[PDB]
Amino acid sequence: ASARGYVNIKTFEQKLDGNKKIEGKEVSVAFPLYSDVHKISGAHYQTFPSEKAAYSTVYEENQRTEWIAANEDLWKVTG
Amino acid sequence: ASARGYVNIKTFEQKLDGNKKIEGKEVSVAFPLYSDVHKISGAHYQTFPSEKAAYSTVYEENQRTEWIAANEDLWKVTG
Amino acid sequence: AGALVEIAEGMATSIAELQEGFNGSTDNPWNEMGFRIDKQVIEAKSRQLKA
Amino acid sequence: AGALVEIAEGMATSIAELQEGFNGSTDNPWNEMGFRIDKQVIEAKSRQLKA
Numbered sequence: 001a002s003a004r005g006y007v008n009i010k011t012f013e014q015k016l017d018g019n020k021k022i023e024g025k026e027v028s029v030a031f032p033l034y035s036d037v038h039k040i041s042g043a044h045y046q047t048f049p050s051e052k053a054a055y056s057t058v059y060e061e062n063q064r065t066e067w068i069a070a071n072e073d074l075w076k077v078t079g
Numbered sequence: 080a081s082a083r084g085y086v087n088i089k090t091f092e093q094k095l096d097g098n099k100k101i102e103g104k105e106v107s108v109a110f111p112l113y114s115d116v117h118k119i120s121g122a123h124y125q126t127f128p129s130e131k132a133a134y135s136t137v138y139e140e141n142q143r144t145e146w147i148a149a150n151e152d153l154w155k156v157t158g
Numbered sequence: 159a160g161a162l163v164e165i166a167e168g169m170a171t172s173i174a175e176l177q178e179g180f181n182g183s184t185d186n187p188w189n190e191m192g193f194r195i196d197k198q199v200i201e202a203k204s205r206q207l208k209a
Numbered sequence: 210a211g212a213l214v215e216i217a218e219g220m221a222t223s224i225a226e227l228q229e230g231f232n233g234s235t236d237n238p239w240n241e242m243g244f245r246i247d248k249q250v251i252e253a254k255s256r257q258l259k260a
Contacts, residue, residue: 003082003111003140042238061082086172091184121182127173168254177257188259 002061005031008054011045011074023076028053030061039071081109081140085132090124090153100157106149107132109140116143118150
């Protein structure tokens with residue numbers, strides 16, 4: 001566990017272009033990892049703190065370069 | 080991993096009685112576990128903090144009842 | 159080459175607090191400094207001539 | 210070598226006028242700036258000797 005807190009990001013996907021999507025992803029983040037680096041803006045999310053991870057995808061105290069790749073990938077454009 | 084710090088307790092074994100001992104125990108403790116419960120006094124020890132556990136037997140953030148049994152087991156008398 | 163660089167640091171104040179047998183710790187002495195005071199001795203070597 | 214030179218310029222007032230969804234335009238938000246405010250933490254380390 002992270003033993004501090006979890007900032008749970010719930011992103012809501014939209015139709016970006018013709019028959020395309022920006023995929024929404026429900027994800028949890030260790031609260032010290034979230035405060036340090038979080039890219040969420042304009043991503044159409046809703047965030048809440050929690051004691052235990054509230055979503056299946058979890059990023060613990062040490063991921064960083066794994067999470068930093070995931071929070072920018074909230075904008076992934078798929079066909 | 081405790082991700083914070085480890086208080087490292089090294090107890091030096093001694094001859095308590097005729098052909099008996101209190102054996103020495105090299106153990107590390109997650110610092111937020113060490114501040115909560117540490118029974119160490121008069122135990123013939125020495126303590127140093129470190130970012131990474133310096134001894135083999137390690138008690139991370141969550142053991143408690145498994146560590147609380149261990150710290151007061153530093154007084155186990157052996158033959 | 160900056161590989162092996164050179165430091166000095168302190169003493170974790172949990173170690174310095176109990177130093178040489180406080181709170182039941184053992185085998186953690188303080189370091190100490192003495193002064194030696196050793197002496198040297200010289201002799202007077204002669205010298206001389208004749209005519 | 211002058212091939213690739215370095216410039217800075219402004220925003221055509223056709224674009225600047227309608228910025229972030231005016232007159233029906235879309236996808237063109239304004240730029241923004243924040244500030245951050247993080248912190249550092251130091252700890253005193255002891256030191257000591259004996260005679």
